[PDB]
């Protein structure tokens with residue numbers, strides 16, 4: 885293919901991600917947000933567990 | 934999960950492993966998914982002249 889051609893001739897960097905889960909403990913997870921640690925106030929806390 | 938504990942304590946004896954309470958702290962929690970049913974320890978020989 886040349887730099888100047890039709891529509892059906894331009895390169896395309898295609899990456900096909902495949903999310904698959906098995907019986908093994910899952911390791912590929914997503915990021916967990918973190919808020920500010922407020923002290924001396926009746927608030928809610930959500931730690932790891 | 935494959936849990937590993939370890940607690941290094943100095944001792945001085947030839948044989949007849951001494952008595953004493955030990956507390957092995959957790960070391961690693963490797964997330965594996967194999968069915969462990971048999972194991973075999975490994976050592977190191979000595980080659981010399």
Ligand SMILES: *[C@@H]1O[C@H](CO)[C@@H](O)[C@H](O)[C@H]1NC(C)=O
Nearest residue numbers: 907908934965966967968969
């Ligand atoms: C034992 O093997 C089976 C085979 O499918 C698997 O589902 C199971 O998670 C394995 N158990 C452990 C503790 O690895």
